[PDB]
Design a protein around this ligand. Structure first.
Ligand SMILES: O=P(O)(O)[C@@](CO)(COCc1nnn[nH]1)OC[C@H]1O[C@@H](n2ncc3c(NC4CCCC4)nc(Cl)nc32)[C@H](O)[C@@H]1O
Ligand SMILES: O=P(O)(O)[C@@](CO)(COCc1nnn[nH]1)OC[C@H]1O[C@@H](n2ncc3c(NC4CCCC4)nc(Cl)nc32)[C@H](O)[C@@H]1O
Ligand SMILES: *[C@@H]1O[C@H](CO)[C@@H](O[C@@H]2O[C@H](CO)[C@@H](O)[C@H](O)[C@H]2NC(C)=O)[C@H](O)[C@H]1NC(C)=O
Ligand SMILES: *[C@@H]1O[C@H](CO)[C@@H](O[C@@H]2O[C@H](CO)[C@@H](O)[C@H](O)[C@H]2NC(C)=O)[C@H](O)[C@H]1NC(C)=O
Ligand SMILES: [Ca+2]
Ligand SMILES: [Ca+2]
Ligand SMILES: [Zn+2]
Ligand SMILES: [Zn+2]
Ligand SMILES: [Zn+2]
Ligand SMILES: [Zn+2]
Lengths: 525, 525
């Protein structure tokens, strides 16, 4: 006997409730838009009507990304995941962005599906308060069988979000194995690991956690595909990606890029003892060929009414593509980063009363903080809604005084694990940096010139290790985020500045028409 | 028996009627201001009271440079040169900026001193109208002797000014020699060549024109000094500069920088036959240690009242020194050039579909005529801007082949080192020169902002591609020897008035801070 299971999966949807452009920015030309929950619902139902055994799983980071989340604060997540009848969700790092209070009340209490993480352990007064609102696993009836779904969440959540001091994030593999072993003693012979630690950790789970049949992941925005890919995303490997486990088995690993653009689809043939005989599938592109379900669409447009205040006023105009995509902004100089750094610098010089920062000419900005492009076609209008998707996190652009030695180490940290699509890669203003990636980690910065301070005419001069420099940067970086521990520990002064989104909108309003270029601020030799 | 003559001389005063800052920009801090006609008058009288034989000579380019000339149109030049009792002036190129009618009516008819040029010949109806209003020479009584003063004016005047089609500008050496020979047959044994063609031409006149005892020049802003110089100007050689003529004699050549900052002072010992036995002197720095003459200052203040409308409104603020000096803007990237090119680009995007993505700018360095100072709250008025951009040109739009553009960048540095105005300031262009290479093949790198691209980046210029550039009408019309532009351009549209563009930009930006960014570089070998 064989038993067939269809796994449908989303990850890193990031508040893209409505359909979007091809690059996940706002939908303008409806005929070429993609994703959104209403389209997803249609494709899910087509599969459900065709296959008997279907699970619809989310691998986390539903929270944060557009004005949907700014206004509704996770209540939209509960509502539309409930309407889609998700079977389970794993907690991502962004689910803790509004604290544990912003997780509990909006999402955990209102979800009609189990929410999972086996490596998150509650301590003190929070333990009884959150008890049973999330679970380490759920065992789900699927026709005549059961399927065990075990959850996990990135160990980096305390450095990326606001989980608070009364949660502990354990190692995934140490936390998962006892739960998986327990499930076997409970006669659960089919086990899916569902979680939010990235493709590299997903592969290690597949390899090391004995009993895991399939891994459904998130957090790295990993596109996997078998065959000719249907859009711009370049596959990192085949779908499914096959890990050869230490216990001698083939464990498929899946992810479905991000932003609800694709629906993950994996058909698994199990034997009677719960072992994978075979699996096949591919992410399904949610393009115009799949219609938006009318009922969901009507419900989305009902919730949309409150959001239209944010798209009323044109702040200004771009005449160039504002490339705020992760493929650009985490690997090389991107023009959206240049815009944000120039706005940071420009708006700080408005504050003429405060003398200590009134010539600040230097800027750093983590590429992973840039969260959407903006499109120039159809008259390139920029509203608050457009900006909210670029800069969703509600942080500030703060002022720090740093030694040149601290800054050189930050630029080394910027490319220490380069190639892995990590957020710590720095966009800059008033700095020209040259990297040589063939050199060893910690010695890749071959040139670092900065705008002078004690000079009448600003020019780019070599950074001196013993000099001191005034930089404008996100509070996330000032507070030691993205492993920038040298900044937090070595900084000499640190002042709070203005709110990030307000800074960029003011700049755009003043400039009216923007046209930021890639200029050679970051080069590679 | 020896006979001693003191030559006092100014050149390229360029409408600096009032005292100025050290760099010839507007006077703000009075205790460190310099020049102006009232201070000059004080120093002239001190010399005149002490030496019996004194001539005060001007070597041209009184016309053009500040709102004095905008408002009074040369009437200020006549009035204050008359008050100083100049003995003679040679016509410079800028004396023709308002046409021959702008020379005749304001200056030639109202000057109480001879105005000189021996290589300017009037033809047709103009000949009888201008007859005797300027002269090729004047023979001046000085004590019990006479001194011949023979005039000359740059051959380049028709390509730099508006002399009109009824003047011919002859070769200096060919035009001077017959007049100098004539003067000898009239028993004038002491001859000064006074003129406006530049230090290199001045040297050739000294060398080749037999009978010339001394050359007093202008037009190259050449600082000559013997000993330790008193201010920021680097001497190009000794004062006087000694030429060995073809007939073996030692001919002193003098110039006195520009802007009325210095008074040229040369003592000459003549024998009874009019040979130069010896000479010595130096330019005298007209700093605060010489008081402004009270009567001239009172008169200046009377004429000043009309001008104060131009200094009423603050257009905006700079927080950096705006280096618009010739020593910067004709030799390397200057930040005033970057400001003007960015203003040109920015203002054009306000408007017309064919030019609405123009990202490339070229600007002749010699068109930038003053710095602006950042100290004392760095205020920018119209008066400040009028000294930067005095010429009343427009910022025009051209379509050009890449081959035309590469040839322009070769012409930009073909005779580099001579302080010539054709050196180009740029926007949306990164140019690298190797000066060790031969003239016409110094451009080793030339990258430009792309047009048919979503994200603007700097890509190598293609010889066969076509490019859209914003530039002065002076360069569009083939000025500064940019003959390739006029002859090869594919379209040419008139744009906005130059000063209005820069003031609008400053008003929009409020606070400006242009840097030297690496738009123009020089390579090692
Ligand atoms: O799955 P995640 O966690 O979202 C993903 C993991 O690699 C993949 O995101 C792909 C993607 N999605 N959309 N665009 N890019 O990126 C995370 C990256 O985001 C940046 N970051 N993380 C947090 C954060 C922040 N503060 C928060 C603290 C409390 C709440 C707000 N402020 C800023 Cl300016 N930047 C921040 C970092 O550079 C980080 O490395
Ligand atoms: O003694 P001159 O002639 O002024 C001096 C000779 O080398 C030395 O000037 C040192 C100095 N003085 N103050 N600052 N720099 O520079 C002349 C340089 O000036 C620029 N130029 N010349 C004319 C001109 C123009 N049109 C005119 C037509 C009617 C009147 C206006 N438009 C423009 Cl944008 N630029 C123009 C060129 O680059 C030229 O090469
Ligand atoms: C929506 O996506 C599908 C999936 O990629 C596209 O369908 C493909 O179309 C091309 C021809 O244009 C064929 O070579 C493929 O075989 C099709 N794949 C299928 C049906 O799975 C479709 O073109 C997209 N819709 C658009 C562009 O409107
Ligand atoms: C005005 O310029 C003169 C130079 O002509 C300055 O006088 C010189 O001052 C230094 C000391 O500061 C002496 O070593 C020189 O011997 C002086 N030279 C002459 C010719 O007097 C004078 O300081 C300047 N005035 C200022 C700065 O107000
Ligand atoms: Ca199994
Ligand atoms: Ca003689
Ligand atoms: Zn995510
Ligand atoms: Zn994540
Ligand atoms: Zn001049
Ligand atoms: Zn001149």
């Amino acid at each position: 006997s064989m038993w067939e299971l269809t796994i449908l999966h989303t990850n890193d949807v990031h508040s893209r409730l409505e359909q979007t452009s091809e690059d996940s920015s706002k939908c303008v030309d409806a005929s070429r838009c993609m994703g959104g929950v209403a389209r997803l619902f249609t494709k899910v139902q087509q599969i459900r009507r065709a296959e008997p055994n279907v699970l619809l799983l989310d691998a986390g980071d539903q929270y944060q990304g557009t004005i949907w989340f700014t206004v509704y604060k996770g209540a939209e997540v509960a509502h539309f995941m409930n309407a889609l009848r998700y079977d389970a969700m794993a907690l991502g790092n962004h689910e803790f962005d509004n604290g544990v209070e912003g997780l509990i009340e909006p999402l955990l209490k209102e979800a009609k599906f189990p929410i999972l993480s086996a490596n998150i352990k509650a301590k003190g007064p929070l333990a009884s308060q959150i008890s049973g609102l999330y679970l380490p696993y759920k065992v789900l009836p699927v026709g005549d069988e059961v399927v065990g779904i075990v959850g996990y969440t990135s160990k980096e959540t305390p450095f990326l979000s606001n989980p608070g001091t009364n949660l502990v994030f354990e190692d995934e593999i140490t936390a998962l194995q006892p739960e998986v072993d327990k499930l076997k003693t409970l006669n659960v012979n089919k086990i899916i690991a569902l979680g939010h630690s990235g493709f590299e950790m997903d592969k290690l789970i597949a390899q090391k956690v004995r009993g895991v049949d399939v891994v459904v992941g998130g957090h790295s925005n990993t596109f996997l595909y078998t065959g000719n890919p249907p859009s711009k995303e370049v596959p990192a490997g085949k779908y499914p990606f096959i890990v050869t486990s230490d216990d001698g088995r083939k464990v498929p690993v899946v992810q479905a890029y991000a932003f609800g653009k694709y629906l993950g689809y994996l058909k698994i043939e199990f034997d009677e003892r719960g072992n994978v005989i075979s699996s096949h599938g591919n992410p399904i592109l949610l393009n115009s060929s799949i219609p938006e379900d009318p009922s969901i669409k009507a419900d989305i447009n009902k919730w949309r009414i409150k959001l239209d205040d944010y798209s009323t006023q044109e702040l200004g105009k771009t005449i160039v593509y504002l490339d705020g995509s992760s493929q650009s902004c985490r690997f090389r100089e991107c023009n959206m980063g240049n815009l944000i750094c120039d706005a940071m610098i420009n708006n700080n010089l408005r504050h003429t009363d405060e003398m200590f920062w009134n010539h600040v000419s230097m800027c750093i900005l983590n590429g992973g903080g840039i969260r959407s492009p903006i499109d120039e076609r159809n008259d390139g209008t920029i509203t608050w809604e457009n900006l909210a998707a670029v800069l969703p996190f509600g942080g500030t652009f703060d002022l720090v005084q740093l030694k040149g030695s601290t800054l050189k180490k930050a630029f080394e940290h910027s490319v220490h694990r380069y190639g892995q699509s990590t957020g710590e890669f720095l966009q800059v203003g008033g700095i020209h940096v040259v990297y040589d990636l063939s050199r060893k980690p910690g010695d890749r910065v071959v040139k670092l010139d900065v705008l002078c301070t004690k000079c009448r005419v600003p020019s780019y001069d070599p950074l001196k290790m013993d000099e001191v420099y005034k930089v404008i940067l996100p509070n996330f970086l000032a507070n030691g985020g993205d492993g920038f521990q040298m900044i937090k520990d070595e900084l000499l002064r640190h002042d709070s500045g203005d709110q990030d989104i307000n800074v960029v909108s003011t700049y755009i309003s003043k400039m009216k028409v923007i046209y930021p270029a890639v200029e050679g601020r970051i080069k590679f030799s």
